[PDB]
Amino acid sequence: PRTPVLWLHGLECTCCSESFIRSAHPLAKDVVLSMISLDYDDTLMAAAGHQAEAILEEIMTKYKGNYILAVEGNPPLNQDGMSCIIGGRPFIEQLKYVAKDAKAIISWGSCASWGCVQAAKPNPTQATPVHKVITDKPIIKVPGCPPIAEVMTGVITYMLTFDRIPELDRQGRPKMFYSQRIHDKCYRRPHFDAGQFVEEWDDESARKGFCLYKMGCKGPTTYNACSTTRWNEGTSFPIQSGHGCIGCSEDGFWDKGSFYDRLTG
Amino acid sequence: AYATQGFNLDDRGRRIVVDPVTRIEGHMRCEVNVDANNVIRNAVSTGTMWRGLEVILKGRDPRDAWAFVERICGVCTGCHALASVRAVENALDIRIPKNAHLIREIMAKTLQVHDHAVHFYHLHALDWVDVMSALKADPKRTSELQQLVSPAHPLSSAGYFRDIQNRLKRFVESGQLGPFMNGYWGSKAYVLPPEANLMAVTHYLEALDLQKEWVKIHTIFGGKNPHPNYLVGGVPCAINLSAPVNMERLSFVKARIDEIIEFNKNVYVPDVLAIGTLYKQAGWLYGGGLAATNVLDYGEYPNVAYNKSTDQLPGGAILNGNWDEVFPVDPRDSQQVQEFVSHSWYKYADESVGLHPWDGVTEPNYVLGANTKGTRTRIEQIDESAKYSWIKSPRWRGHAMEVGPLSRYILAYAHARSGNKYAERPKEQLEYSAQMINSAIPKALGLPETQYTLKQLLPSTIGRTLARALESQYCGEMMHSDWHDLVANIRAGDTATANVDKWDPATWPLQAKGVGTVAAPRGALGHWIRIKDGRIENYQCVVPTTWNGSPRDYKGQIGAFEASLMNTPMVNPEQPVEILRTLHSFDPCLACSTH
Ligand code: SF4
Ligand code: F3S
Ligand SMILES: [Cl-]
Ligand SMILES: [Mg+2]
């Protein structure tokens, strides 16, 4: 038997679902067909409406305390919760219902982990991360907008193999993927150390791959696997392609000033 | 009951609710009424999410905006970033260098192909394809079908189809059906033979593995996918033949483009032609909606940067089904694009008026009408006579329009007939497709040949699905050309990727307004910005699914989703197969629609 996954969607842009299917090792195809049973997911599921709703209670009963709840997006608390409506009811009610009998909860991406863009000031919907609503269940945060594909499938693979949540840091992120800051192993680090910086876009320094700190790179304060694991089967990452890290895996990164203002000190 | 746009709306029949609408991006509720013979006679589109990006942007730096609005949507990832940088560049009179233009075009066309192909296989296909029927297919006859549908596709052997079928069998036999659980399998609404179903499911799996390769083009130029990085003034991926872009990276991009062209030509377009032919033969020509009368696009992909007369998908507006007259569309004109909130969960000072997006307002107002069944937090039947959606109601000169690939292909065809040579390829694709659907494929499958015109075939759910596939193919062909132009320009000595003359806000006018438009995968996208003292004063988005999924306006006119469902019979009113098939043909993105 393959562990059921109920993948709920709150307020979101769907980047985390899209990132998941970019995974090369393992393939998303193999994850869905051979590793998990993806029993509810609005993005891919055949059933709609009443038939889709009926799946949740069936799985929750049959696999009580033995399914994984994955959450993409987050619940809004304003507009009586009806700025995110599922089956005529607030999303927060679905979230709490499915959470109650889950063996573990995965908060996918910055939305579920921290709030992401909808929670940026002034947060008109009072979008709230999952761990502030569900306070009595074990939650693993997998932040990033979106997270790296192999980080997402890496978390699933660990959980399925070992029937355990991996070791987490104080913020609830898996240490196996979020122990390093981008700046630790960023390939432009030798330029940083030598005081060699891009100062205007497409200047001579930019064409030589000089450090992007003075163009606002938030790599020095951002924990993720981007500089080593990299993106889309190790093809590139933001810095390699010439833009500074904007800090997208860190709590509240939208409200830490302009992306192009350098870090102080 | 009332009449509007040639549709006789009637809510006296049996009410059917579909919430959630699945296999879309984001959150939608749909309700219909059906008559005594299960024919839809009323349709209600409800966007069931809102985040408030327009509100969040106020006071921020215009140079940062692209990253915020990019997160409107991770499916159409980057198109909002493109609209945003275009809007800011327009406001500040910034012209980007040629290489930046070409790289942006290549990224845009990569998105088009990825979005279209993934939509068709992974979201749309299960409305046409019965997966359980695929289990009963004969591997040998499936191989023979594949060779008829697309002889150039190398994955066609009986053994190959047998192995795929066997994997599907054991998956189903496990009793854990996953995404196929509680499906509508065996419904009479499904018409494909077992062999066509197995071919399609096989391609579903092929596409799922291949799609991750295509987006590596975004990764090279933009660092990551989803959500590649953009830049006001150009692109960040500087060129040096230790740089972000060198010849090896460009060669890699070309290899990915060539793969894309093979997929579109050998797998995607032939499948849609074949499936379309078989549903045409079944008489399933429903879903035309507004495409039969009113279509709009801003126009896109100029052969010469900043020269709109050279748009390779030339736009404008058509009204009343008159394809001999394309009206020009100006996103700056306060009397053209306007948004109403009469039936939306927002508030204006005067809701009898539609606001141009430079004057747009986004103040939420979640309130339900008197005829609602249920409560504010437990809706049983939504009241479409009052406010019923988080989607605003965009109109053009007061008219309700359909947008999207179908709209663009109808516009391209009309332009081509008037003598526009930039639209020759789409015209060629359409005429080729009609001949395949009417004659070639029927002849190959031993079916009767038909004589539908493009005027008859295009305004339908089949036509809407076809146009998307053709557009994917055309975009692949275009970015192949763009790649050659990029490499030639670089080799000629121009390596520039960013104009930084007006990067610093000390150089800006103290106030400015701008608009950026994009032919996004789902239709006409625009971002309208006002800048004051270096900050965003107003930022309003009108997004393709805002047009298509819109609720009724002040005059009670219906939008494209609602019109498309009208007058469609359902095999079983409790199984939303036909509702899903037609809604999905618009590729609804609800996060986009509401932002
Ligand atoms: S580019 Fe960013 S992460 Fe890399 S060395 Fe410079 S500051 Fe650190
Ligand atoms: S912007 Fe995000 S994707 Fe990585 S390089 Fe920075 S954490
Ligand atoms: Cl955040
Ligand atoms: Mg808007």
PDB file of C-alpha atoms in Angstrom, chain B residues 216-407:
ATOM      1  CA  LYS B 216      15.136  24.829 -18.606  1.00  0.00           C
ATOM      2  CA  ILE B 217      15.063  27.714 -21.147  1.00  0.00           C
ATOM      3  CA  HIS B 218      13.548  29.851 -18.344  1.00  0.00           C
ATOM      4  CA  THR B 219      16.185  28.536 -15.964  1.00  0.00           C
ATOM      5  CA  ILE B 220      19.048  29.655 -18.199  1.00  0.00           C
ATOM      6  CA  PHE B 221      17.748  33.187 -18.831  1.00  0.00           C
ATOM      7  CA  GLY B 222      15.784  33.689 -15.575  1.00  0.00           C
ATOM      8  CA  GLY B 223      17.496  31.497 -12.946  1.00  0.00           C
ATOM      9  CA  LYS B 224      14.570  29.223 -12.070  1.00  0.00           C
ATOM     10  CA  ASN B 225      11.193  27.881 -13.089  1.00  0.00           C
ATOM     11  CA  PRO B 226       8.627  28.508 -11.745  1.00  0.00           C
ATOM     12  CA  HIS B 227       9.100  32.267 -11.243  1.00  0.00           C
ATOM     13  CA  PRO B 228      12.089  33.278 -13.378  1.00  0.00           C
ATOM     14  CA  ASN B 229      13.623  36.688 -12.713  1.00  0.00           C
ATOM     15  CA  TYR B 230      12.975  39.761 -14.861  1.00  0.00           C
ATOM     16  CA  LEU B 231      14.416  43.298 -14.859  1.00  0.00           C
ATOM     17  CA  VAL B 232      13.186  46.813 -15.587  1.00  0.00           C
ATOM     18  CA  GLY B 233      15.351  47.959 -18.515  1.00  0.00           C
ATOM     19  CA  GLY B 234      16.289  44.553 -19.958  1.00  0.00           C
ATOM     20  CA  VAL B 235      17.353  41.145 -18.653  1.00  0.00           C
ATOM     21  CA  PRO B 236      19.834  40.175 -15.881  1.00  0.00           C
ATOM     22  CA  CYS B 237      21.462  37.374 -17.891  1.00  0.00           C
ATOM     23  CA  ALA B 238      24.559  39.224 -19.150  1.00  0.00           C
ATOM     24  CA  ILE B 239      26.414  37.899 -22.197  1.00  0.00           C
ATOM     25  CA  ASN B 240      30.117  36.966 -22.592  1.00  0.00           C
ATOM     26  CA  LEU B 241      31.389  34.454 -25.166  1.00  0.00           C
ATOM     27  CA  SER B 242      31.965  33.341 -16.400  1.00  0.00           C
ATOM     28  CA  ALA B 243      28.824  35.158 -17.657  1.00  0.00           C
ATOM     29  CA  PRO B 244      25.179  34.064 -17.291  1.00  0.00           C
ATOM     30  CA  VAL B 245      24.956  33.600 -21.079  1.00  0.00           C
ATOM     31  CA  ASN B 246      27.665  32.195 -23.341  1.00  0.00           C
ATOM     32  CA  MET B 247      27.563  30.128 -26.538  1.00  0.00           C
ATOM     33  CA  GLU B 248      27.271  26.803 -24.662  1.00  0.00           C
ATOM     34  CA  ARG B 249      24.199  28.089 -22.809  1.00  0.00           C
ATOM     35  CA  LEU B 250      22.688  29.306 -26.091  1.00  0.00           C
ATOM     36  CA  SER B 251      23.357  25.911 -27.728  1.00  0.00           C
ATOM     37  CA  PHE B 252      21.560  24.281 -24.774  1.00  0.00           C
ATOM     38  CA  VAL B 253      18.535  26.570 -25.312  1.00  0.00           C
ATOM     39  CA  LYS B 254      18.460  25.635 -29.037  1.00  0.00           C
ATOM     40  CA  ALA B 255      18.444  21.901 -28.203  1.00  0.00           C
ATOM     41  CA  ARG B 256      15.418  22.474 -25.953  1.00  0.00           C
ATOM     42  CA  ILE B 257      13.644  24.506 -28.662  1.00  0.00           C
ATOM     43  CA  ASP B 258      14.193  21.739 -31.223  1.00  0.00           C
ATOM     44  CA  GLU B 259      12.649  19.194 -28.804  1.00  0.00           C
ATOM     45  CA  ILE B 260       9.669  21.500 -28.341  1.00  0.00           C
ATOM     46  CA  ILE B 261       9.098  21.701 -32.093  1.00  0.00           C
ATOM     47  CA  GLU B 262       9.133  17.898 -32.398  1.00  0.00           C
ATOM     48  CA  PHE B 263       6.640  17.478 -29.541  1.00  0.00           C
ATOM     49  CA  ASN B 264       4.162  20.034 -30.923  1.00  0.00           C
ATOM     50  CA  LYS B 265       4.354  18.619 -34.453  1.00  0.00           C
ATOM     51  CA  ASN B 266       4.388  14.874 -33.604  1.00  0.00           C
ATOM     52  CA  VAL B 267       2.367  14.518 -30.383  1.00  0.00           C
ATOM     53  CA  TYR B 268       0.276  17.534 -29.348  1.00  0.00           C
ATOM     54  CA  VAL B 269      -1.222  18.908 -32.600  1.00  0.00           C
ATOM     55  CA  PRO B 270      -1.972  15.428 -34.066  1.00  0.00           C
ATOM     56  CA  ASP B 271      -3.698  14.287 -30.834  1.00  0.00           C
ATOM     57  CA  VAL B 272      -5.930  17.366 -30.772  1.00  0.00           C
ATOM     58  CA  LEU B 273      -6.748  16.965 -34.491  1.00  0.00           C
ATOM     59  CA  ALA B 274      -7.631  13.271 -33.945  1.00  0.00           C
ATOM     60  CA  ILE B 275      -9.651  13.773 -30.751  1.00  0.00           C
ATOM     61  CA  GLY B 276     -11.349  16.821 -32.298  1.00  0.00           C
ATOM     62  CA  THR B 277     -12.265  14.809 -35.404  1.00  0.00           C
ATOM     63  CA  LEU B 278     -13.858  12.023 -33.375  1.00  0.00           C
ATOM     64  CA  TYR B 279     -15.915  14.399 -31.176  1.00  0.00           C
ATOM     65  CA  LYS B 280     -16.880  16.359 -34.328  1.00  0.00           C
ATOM     66  CA  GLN B 281     -18.114  13.045 -35.811  1.00  0.00           C
ATOM     67  CA  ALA B 282     -20.186  12.554 -32.618  1.00  0.00           C
ATOM     68  CA  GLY B 283     -21.788  15.977 -33.314  1.00  0.00           C
ATOM     69  CA  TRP B 284     -20.315  17.599 -30.202  1.00  0.00           C
ATOM     70  CA  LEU B 285     -19.922  21.162 -31.486  1.00  0.00           C
ATOM     71  CA  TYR B 286     -21.144  22.883 -28.297  1.00  0.00           C
ATOM     72  CA  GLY B 287     -19.334  25.570 -26.336  1.00  0.00           C
ATOM     73  CA  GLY B 288     -18.911  28.410 -28.845  1.00  0.00           C
ATOM     74  CA  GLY B 289     -20.302  31.021 -26.458  1.00  0.00           C
ATOM     75  CA  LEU B 290     -19.005  34.516 -27.229  1.00  0.00           C
ATOM     76  CA  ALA B 291     -16.379  33.248 -29.719  1.00  0.00           C
ATOM     77  CA  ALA B 292     -19.151  33.220 -32.345  1.00  0.00           C
ATOM     78  CA  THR B 293     -19.535  37.021 -31.987  1.00  0.00           C
ATOM     79  CA  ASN B 294     -17.026  38.992 -29.898  1.00  0.00           C
ATOM     80  CA  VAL B 295     -13.275  38.279 -29.567  1.00  0.00           C
ATOM     81  CA  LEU B 296     -10.360  40.459 -28.380  1.00  0.00           C
ATOM     82  CA  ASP B 297      -6.579  40.414 -28.003  1.00  0.00           C
ATOM     83  CA  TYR B 298      -4.059  43.278 -27.645  1.00  0.00           C
ATOM     84  CA  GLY B 299      -1.801  41.813 -30.362  1.00  0.00           C
ATOM     85  CA  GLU B 300       1.680  40.440 -29.752  1.00  0.00           C
ATOM     86  CA  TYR B 301       5.104  39.280 -31.026  1.00  0.00           C
ATOM     87  CA  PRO B 302       6.207  42.089 -33.328  1.00  0.00           C
ATOM     88  CA  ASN B 303       8.880  41.048 -35.899  1.00  0.00           C
ATOM     89  CA  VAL B 304      10.370  44.479 -35.210  1.00  0.00           C
ATOM     90  CA  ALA B 305      10.563  45.604 -31.562  1.00  0.00           C
ATOM     91  CA  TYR B 306       8.201  48.484 -30.635  1.00  0.00           C
ATOM     92  CA  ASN B 307       6.527  48.281 -34.112  1.00  0.00           C
ATOM     93  CA  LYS B 308       3.005  47.017 -33.544  1.00  0.00           C
ATOM     94  CA  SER B 309       2.157  46.782 -37.272  1.00  0.00           C
ATOM     95  CA  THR B 310       4.562  43.795 -37.352  1.00  0.00           C
ATOM     96  CA  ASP B 311       2.712  41.728 -34.666  1.00  0.00           C
ATOM     97  CA  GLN B 312       2.870  38.036 -35.623  1.00  0.00           C
ATOM     98  CA  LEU B 313      -0.311  37.471 -33.634  1.00  0.00           C
ATOM     99  CA  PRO B 314      -2.043  40.690 -34.709  1.00  0.00           C
ATOM    100  CA  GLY B 315      -4.851  41.755 -32.401  1.00  0.00           C
ATOM    101  CA  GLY B 316      -7.847  44.047 -32.134  1.00  0.00           C
ATOM    102  CA  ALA B 317     -11.527  43.378 -31.541  1.00  0.00           C
ATOM    103  CA  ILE B 318     -14.201  41.644 -33.623  1.00  0.00           C
ATOM    104  CA  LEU B 319     -17.909  42.212 -32.907  1.00  0.00           C
ATOM    105  CA  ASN B 320     -21.123  40.451 -33.943  1.00  0.00           C
ATOM    106  CA  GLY B 321     -19.311  37.630 -35.803  1.00  0.00           C
ATOM    107  CA  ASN B 322     -18.174  40.035 -38.517  1.00  0.00           C
ATOM    108  CA  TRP B 323     -14.718  38.728 -39.426  1.00  0.00           C
ATOM    109  CA  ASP B 324     -14.362  41.301 -42.241  1.00  0.00           C
ATOM    110  CA  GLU B 325     -13.839  44.162 -39.737  1.00  0.00           C
ATOM    111  CA  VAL B 326     -11.165  44.201 -37.013  1.00  0.00           C
ATOM    112  CA  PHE B 327     -11.383  47.245 -34.727  1.00  0.00           C
ATOM    113  CA  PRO B 328      -8.163  48.599 -33.227  1.00  0.00           C
ATOM    114  CA  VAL B 329      -7.790  48.160 -29.467  1.00  0.00           C
ATOM    115  CA  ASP B 330      -5.996  50.873 -27.486  1.00  0.00           C
ATOM    116  CA  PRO B 331      -5.201  50.019 -23.825  1.00  0.00           C
ATOM    117  CA  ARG B 332      -4.654  53.765 -23.105  1.00  0.00           C
ATOM    118  CA  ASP B 333      -8.193  54.802 -24.141  1.00  0.00           C
ATOM    119  CA  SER B 334     -10.414  55.400 -21.081  1.00  0.00           C
ATOM    120  CA  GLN B 335     -13.527  54.468 -23.130  1.00  0.00           C
ATOM    121  CA  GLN B 336     -12.286  51.040 -24.288  1.00  0.00           C
ATOM    122  CA  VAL B 337     -11.152  48.631 -21.522  1.00  0.00           C
ATOM    123  CA  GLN B 338     -13.308  49.136 -18.412  1.00  0.00           C
ATOM    124  CA  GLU B 339     -14.137  46.964 -15.397  1.00  0.00           C
ATOM    125  CA  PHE B 340     -17.510  46.769 -13.681  1.00  0.00           C
ATOM    126  CA  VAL B 341     -18.128  45.382 -10.168  1.00  0.00           C
ATOM    127  CA  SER B 342     -21.955  45.386 -10.239  1.00  0.00           C
ATOM    128  CA  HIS B 343     -21.985  41.594  -9.677  1.00  0.00           C
ATOM    129  CA  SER B 344     -18.546  41.285  -8.033  1.00  0.00           C
ATOM    130  CA  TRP B 345     -17.448  41.382  -4.368  1.00  0.00           C
ATOM    131  CA  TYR B 346     -15.987  44.874  -4.586  1.00  0.00           C
ATOM    132  CA  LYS B 347     -17.273  48.426  -4.101  1.00  0.00           C
ATOM    133  CA  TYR B 348     -17.172  51.540  -6.316  1.00  0.00           C
ATOM    134  CA  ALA B 349     -18.597  54.986  -5.544  1.00  0.00           C
ATOM    135  CA  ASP B 350     -20.921  54.391  -8.539  1.00  0.00           C
ATOM    136  CA  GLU B 351     -21.311  50.781  -9.693  1.00  0.00           C
ATOM    137  CA  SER B 352     -23.351  51.750 -12.777  1.00  0.00           C
ATOM    138  CA  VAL B 353     -19.968  52.815 -14.212  1.00  0.00           C
ATOM    139  CA  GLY B 354     -17.000  50.816 -15.569  1.00  0.00           C
ATOM    140  CA  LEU B 355     -13.525  52.052 -14.626  1.00  0.00           C
ATOM    141  CA  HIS B 356     -10.523  52.121 -16.935  1.00  0.00           C
ATOM    142  CA  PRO B 357      -7.635  50.490 -15.096  1.00  0.00           C
ATOM    143  CA  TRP B 358      -5.636  53.749 -14.656  1.00  0.00           C
ATOM    144  CA  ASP B 359      -8.650  54.835 -12.599  1.00  0.00           C
ATOM    145  CA  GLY B 360      -9.292  51.365 -11.136  1.00  0.00           C
ATOM    146  CA  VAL B 361     -10.293  50.667  -7.537  1.00  0.00           C
ATOM    147  CA  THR B 362     -10.064  47.425  -5.537  1.00  0.00           C
ATOM    148  CA  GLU B 363     -12.002  47.653  -2.274  1.00  0.00           C
ATOM    149  CA  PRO B 364     -13.387  44.270  -1.192  1.00  0.00           C
ATOM    150  CA  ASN B 365     -17.078  43.855  -0.376  1.00  0.00           C
ATOM    151  CA  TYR B 366     -18.058  40.276   0.374  1.00  0.00           C
ATOM    152  CA  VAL B 367     -21.867  40.299   0.621  1.00  0.00           C
ATOM    153  CA  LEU B 368     -24.488  37.811  -0.612  1.00  0.00           C
ATOM    154  CA  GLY B 369     -27.845  38.477  -2.251  1.00  0.00           C
ATOM    155  CA  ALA B 370     -31.291  38.029  -0.736  1.00  0.00           C
ATOM    156  CA  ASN B 371     -32.043  34.904  -2.816  1.00  0.00           C
ATOM    157  CA  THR B 372     -28.999  32.998  -1.509  1.00  0.00           C
ATOM    158  CA  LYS B 373     -29.666  29.485  -0.231  1.00  0.00           C
ATOM    159  CA  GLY B 374     -27.472  28.969   2.822  1.00  0.00           C
ATOM    160  CA  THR B 375     -25.471  31.430   4.907  1.00  0.00           C
ATOM    161  CA  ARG B 376     -22.490  33.790   4.471  1.00  0.00           C
ATOM    162  CA  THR B 377     -20.077  30.980   5.407  1.00  0.00           C
ATOM    163  CA  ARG B 378     -22.055  27.994   4.055  1.00  0.00           C
ATOM    164  CA  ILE B 379     -23.371  28.643   0.553  1.00  0.00           C
ATOM    165  CA  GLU B 380     -25.756  26.062  -0.920  1.00  0.00           C
ATOM    166  CA  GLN B 381     -26.956  28.075  -3.942  1.00  0.00           C
ATOM    167  CA  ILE B 382     -25.315  31.344  -4.936  1.00  0.00           C
ATOM    168  CA  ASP B 383     -27.520  34.329  -5.899  1.00  0.00           C
ATOM    169  CA  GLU B 384     -26.369  35.530  -9.340  1.00  0.00           C
ATOM    170  CA  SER B 385     -28.874  38.455  -9.279  1.00  0.00           C
ATOM    171  CA  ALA B 386     -26.512  40.140  -6.778  1.00  0.00           C
ATOM    172  CA  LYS B 387     -22.722  39.969  -6.154  1.00  0.00           C
ATOM    173  CA  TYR B 388     -21.415  36.468  -6.839  1.00  0.00           C
ATOM    174  CA  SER B 389     -17.690  36.491  -7.633  1.00  0.00           C
ATOM    175  CA  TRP B 390     -14.221  37.744  -6.718  1.00  0.00           C
ATOM    176  CA  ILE B 391     -13.669  38.356 -10.447  1.00  0.00           C
ATOM    177  CA  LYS B 392     -14.309  41.873 -11.791  1.00  0.00           C
ATOM    178  CA  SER B 393     -16.205  42.336 -15.091  1.00  0.00           C
ATOM    179  CA  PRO B 394     -13.986  43.673 -17.886  1.00  0.00           C
ATOM    180  CA  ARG B 395     -15.695  44.925 -21.038  1.00  0.00           C
ATOM    181  CA  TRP B 396     -14.469  46.606 -24.244  1.00  0.00           C
ATOM    182  CA  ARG B 397     -16.464  49.695 -25.229  1.00  0.00           C
ATOM    183  CA  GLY B 398     -19.185  48.060 -23.084  1.00  0.00           C
ATOM    184  CA  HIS B 399     -19.089  44.752 -25.009  1.00  0.00           C
ATOM    185  CA  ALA B 400     -18.445  41.372 -23.447  1.00  0.00           C
ATOM    186  CA  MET B 401     -15.551  39.635 -25.217  1.00  0.00           C
ATOM    187  CA  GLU B 402     -13.858  36.221 -25.269  1.00  0.00           C
ATOM    188  CA  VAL B 403     -10.033  36.257 -25.057  1.00  0.00           C
ATOM    189  CA  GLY B 404      -7.444  33.499 -25.542  1.00  0.00           C
ATOM    190  CA  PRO B 405      -5.716  31.463 -28.242  1.00  0.00           C
ATOM    191  CA  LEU B 406      -9.043  30.987 -30.091  1.00  0.00           C
ATOM    192  CA  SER B 407      -9.605  34.742 -30.049  1.00  0.00           C
TER     193      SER B 407
END
